[PDB]
Design an enzyme around this catalytic site. Sequence first.
Site, PDB file in Angstrom:
ATOM      1  N   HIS A  64      -1.893 -15.895   9.811  1.00 46.88           N
ATOM      2  CA  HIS A  64      -1.440 -15.955   8.423  1.00 46.88           C
ATOM      3  C   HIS A  64      -0.219 -15.044   8.224  1.00 46.88           C
ATOM      4  O   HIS A  64       0.697 -15.359   7.466  1.00 46.88           O
ATOM      5  CB  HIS A  64      -2.588 -15.552   7.483  1.00 46.88           C
ATOM      6  CG  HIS A  64      -3.860 -16.334   7.664  1.00 46.88           C
ATOM      7  ND1 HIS A  64      -3.993 -17.674   7.351  1.00 46.88           N
ATOM      8  CD2 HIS A  64      -5.074 -15.929   8.080  1.00 46.88           C
ATOM      9  CE1 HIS A  64      -5.240 -18.056   7.592  1.00 46.88           C
ATOM     10  NE2 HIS A  64      -5.924 -17.012   8.014  1.00 46.88           N
ATOM     11  N   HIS A  94       1.208  -5.353   6.068  1.00 46.69           N
ATOM     12  CA  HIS A  94       1.697  -6.652   6.445  1.00 46.69           C
ATOM     13  C   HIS A  94       2.762  -7.091   5.448  1.00 46.69           C
ATOM     14  O   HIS A  94       2.933  -6.432   4.412  1.00 46.69           O
ATOM     15  CB  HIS A  94       0.558  -7.670   6.510  1.00 46.69           C
ATOM     16  CG  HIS A  94      -0.149  -7.814   5.188  1.00 46.69           C
ATOM     17  ND1 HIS A  94      -1.153  -7.000   4.762  1.00 46.69           N
ATOM     18  CD2 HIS A  94       0.220  -8.593   4.199  1.00 46.69           C
ATOM     19  CE1 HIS A  94      -1.480  -7.419   3.473  1.00 46.69           C
ATOM     20  NE2 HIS A  94      -0.641  -8.356   3.150  1.00 46.69           N
ATOM     21  N   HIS A  96       4.595 -10.716   3.372  1.00 47.20           N
ATOM     22  CA  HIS A  96       4.681 -12.125   3.033  1.00 47.20           C
ATOM     23  C   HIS A  96       6.150 -12.482   2.899  1.00 47.20           C
ATOM     24  O   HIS A  96       6.907 -11.675   2.386  1.00 47.20           O
ATOM     25  CB  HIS A  96       3.976 -12.409   1.690  1.00 47.20           C
ATOM     26  CG  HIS A  96       2.571 -11.905   1.641  1.00 47.20           C
ATOM     27  ND1 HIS A  96       1.486 -12.739   1.852  1.00 47.20           N
ATOM     28  CD2 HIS A  96       2.057 -10.691   1.438  1.00 47.20           C
ATOM     29  CE1 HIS A  96       0.356 -12.019   1.761  1.00 47.20           C
ATOM     30  NE2 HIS A  96       0.679 -10.753   1.581  1.00 47.20           N
ATOM     31  N   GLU A 106       5.290 -12.334  -3.401  1.00 45.22           N
ATOM     32  CA  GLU A 106       4.088 -12.764  -4.106  1.00 45.22           C
ATOM     33  C   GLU A 106       4.253 -12.369  -5.555  1.00 45.22           C
ATOM     34  O   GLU A 106       4.198 -13.230  -6.444  1.00 45.22           O
ATOM     35  CB  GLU A 106       2.879 -12.137  -3.441  1.00 45.22           C
ATOM     36  CG  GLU A 106       2.706 -12.654  -2.026  1.00 45.22           C
ATOM     37  CD  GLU A 106       1.298 -12.682  -1.544  1.00 45.22           C
ATOM     38  OE1 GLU A 106       0.670 -11.601  -1.588  1.00 45.22           O
ATOM     39  OE2 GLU A 106       0.836 -13.798  -1.197  1.00 45.22           O
ATOM     40  N   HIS A 119       3.031  -5.122   1.860  1.00 38.98           N
ATOM     41  CA  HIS A 119       1.798  -4.611   1.303  1.00 38.98           C
ATOM     42  C   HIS A 119       1.268  -3.544   2.253  1.00 38.98           C
ATOM     43  O   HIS A 119       0.826  -3.902   3.353  1.00 38.98           O
ATOM     44  CB  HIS A 119       0.811  -5.778   1.226  1.00 38.98           C
ATOM     45  CG  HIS A 119       1.187  -6.738   0.130  1.00 38.98           C
ATOM     46  ND1 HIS A 119       0.699  -8.029   0.063  1.00 38.98           N
ATOM     47  CD2 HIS A 119       2.042  -6.602  -0.886  1.00 38.98           C
ATOM     48  CE1 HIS A 119       1.195  -8.631  -1.006  1.00 38.98           C
ATOM     49  NE2 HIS A 119       2.017  -7.809  -1.629  1.00 38.98           N
ATOM     50  N   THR A 198      -4.610 -11.140  -2.273  1.00 35.60           N
ATOM     51  CA  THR A 198      -3.847 -12.347  -2.485  1.00 35.60           C
ATOM     52  C   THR A 198      -4.132 -13.443  -1.469  1.00 35.60           C
ATOM     53  O   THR A 198      -3.467 -14.458  -1.488  1.00 35.60           O
ATOM     54  CB  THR A 198      -2.356 -12.093  -2.553  1.00 35.60           C
ATOM     55  OG1 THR A 198      -1.957 -11.674  -1.202  1.00 35.60           O
ATOM     56  CG2 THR A 198      -1.955 -11.028  -3.532  1.00 35.60           C
TER      57      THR A 198
HETATM   58  N1  LIG Z   1      -8.681   1.644  11.832  1.00 35.73           N
HETATM   59  S1  LIG Z   1      -8.804   0.423  12.862  1.00 35.73           S
HETATM   60  O1  LIG Z   1     -10.121   0.497  13.458  1.00 35.73           O
HETATM   61  O2  LIG Z   1      -7.637   0.444  13.713  1.00 35.73           O
HETATM   62  C1  LIG Z   1      -8.766  -1.060  11.907  1.00 35.73           C
HETATM   63  C2  LIG Z   1      -9.881  -1.882  11.882  1.00 35.73           C
HETATM   64  C3  LIG Z   1      -9.811  -3.100  11.224  1.00 35.73           C
HETATM   65  C4  LIG Z   1      -8.641  -3.504  10.597  1.00 35.73           C
HETATM   66  C5  LIG Z   1      -8.549  -4.837   9.906  1.00 35.73           C
HETATM   67  C6  LIG Z   1      -9.035  -4.736   8.497  1.00 35.73           C
HETATM   68  N2  LIG Z   1      -9.159  -6.036   7.846  1.00 35.73           N
HETATM   69  C7  LIG Z   1      -8.189  -6.475   7.015  1.00 35.73           C
HETATM   70  O3  LIG Z   1      -7.169  -5.799   6.827  1.00 35.73           O
HETATM   71  N3  LIG Z   1      -8.429  -7.666   6.384  1.00 35.73           N
HETATM   72  C8  LIG Z   1      -7.503  -8.261   5.420  1.00 35.73           C
HETATM   73  C9  LIG Z   1      -7.987  -8.122   3.957  1.00 35.73           C
HETATM   74  C10 LIG Z   1      -6.833  -8.151   2.982  1.00 35.73           C
HETATM   75  C11 LIG Z   1      -6.431  -9.351   2.416  1.00 35.73           C
HETATM   76  C12 LIG Z   1      -5.353  -9.409   1.546  1.00 35.73           C
HETATM   77  C13 LIG Z   1      -4.667  -8.251   1.238  1.00 35.73           C
HETATM   78  S2  LIG Z   1      -3.250  -8.334   0.197  1.00 35.73           S
HETATM   79  N4  LIG Z   1      -2.330  -9.578   0.560  1.00 35.73           N
HETATM   80  O4  LIG Z   1      -3.749  -8.645  -1.145  1.00 35.73           O
HETATM   81  O5  LIG Z   1      -2.519  -7.096   0.319  1.00 35.73           O
HETATM   82  C14 LIG Z   1      -5.049  -7.032   1.792  1.00 35.73           C
HETATM   83  C15 LIG Z   1      -6.129  -6.991   2.657  1.00 35.73           C
HETATM   84  C16 LIG Z   1      -7.538  -2.662  10.637  1.00 35.73           C
HETATM   85  C17 LIG Z   1      -7.592  -1.442  11.283  1.00 35.73           C
HETATM   86 ZN   LIG Z   2      -0.548  -9.119   1.272  1.00 41.47          ZN
END
Ligand SMILES: NS(=O)(=O)c1ccc(CCNC(=O)NCCc2ccc(S(N)(=O)=O)cc2)cc1
Ligand SMILES: [Zn+2]
Length: 259
Positions: A64, A94, A96, A106, A119, A198
């Site tokens: 994504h 990340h 967009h 966004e 973000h 989002t």
């Molecule tokens: N510390 S570690 O063990 O290295 C470590 C362990 C795991 C992870 C991944 C976390 N999962 C994640 O970020 N999911 C996306 C959810 C999300 C969706 C949408 C937005 S948005 N687009 O609204 O900003 C934000 C977040 C990272 C680091």
């Molecule tokens: Zn985002």
Amino acid sequence: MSHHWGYGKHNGPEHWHKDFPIAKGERQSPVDIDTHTAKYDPSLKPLSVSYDQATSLRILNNGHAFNVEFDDSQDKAVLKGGPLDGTYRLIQFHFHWGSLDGQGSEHTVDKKKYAAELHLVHWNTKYGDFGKAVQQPDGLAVLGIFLKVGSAKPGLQKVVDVLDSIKTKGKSADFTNFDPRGLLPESLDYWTYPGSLTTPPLLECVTWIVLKEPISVSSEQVLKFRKLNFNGEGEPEELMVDNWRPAQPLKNRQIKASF
Ligand SMILES: NS(=O)(=O)c1ccc(CCNC(=O)NCCc2ccc(S(N)(=O)=O)cc2)cc1
Ligand SMILES: [Zn+2]
Ligand SMILES: NCCc1ccc(S(N)(=O)=O)cc1
């Protein structure tokens, strides 16, 4: 393991509600920021971004976007102040972005779309882990920064240069010793409102903090983002572009300005 949402005509934002009915909820993100209607709130505090001890670890193409992940097992890179109560730890950032420089953000500002949006995702330490935080109305703080195309952003170039090694979904690469301070604008003036993730699962757990000042990146920087793939290796090539959700109804919310 059974998620099939994305950004195509057959699985994009108009379809999400069928698997994630909160898509039509009361505090969805992103929104248009009507700058005339946002109210200055003098009680808002300056944002405190403490990223000096940040520990980046890895960069992943998740099908994504790409995420740069951080060690969040101690208070190494935290966001506090502004609208927030308590301490929020950085877990990942990340972007967009669009297929063209005239779209990709966004959030919009008086309906203006930027070329991309960064973000920086943070979770409230009182909830102990990220998975618990996303289940709470004040669990996350997302710092959103607009990207406009102009002069290069030197602090972005290490990201741009590694993207060859994560072209397709599921690929990751070591990404240690990256300083996220290199992605911030000079000013930390901001807008804030209560919202959501989002992307699916679209949970309504985010305090949004959207900086007023965009960063500038070069045409060549954002051009490289658009050479990534949504697909896995050996699958039909689909360029990773237009991975943005459009603005959602503001409903019963007020956007507050720090300035
Ligand atoms: N510390 S570690 O063990 O290295 C470590 C362990 C795991 C992870 C991944 C976390 N999962 C994640 O970020 N999911 C996306 C959810 C999300 C969706 C949408 C937005 S948005 N687009 O609204 O900003 C934000 C977040 C990272 C680091
Ligand atoms: Zn985002
Ligand atoms: N119709 C193609 C398959 C399919 C399309 C969309 C979604 S959703 N609601 O999660 O965006 C799931 C599966």
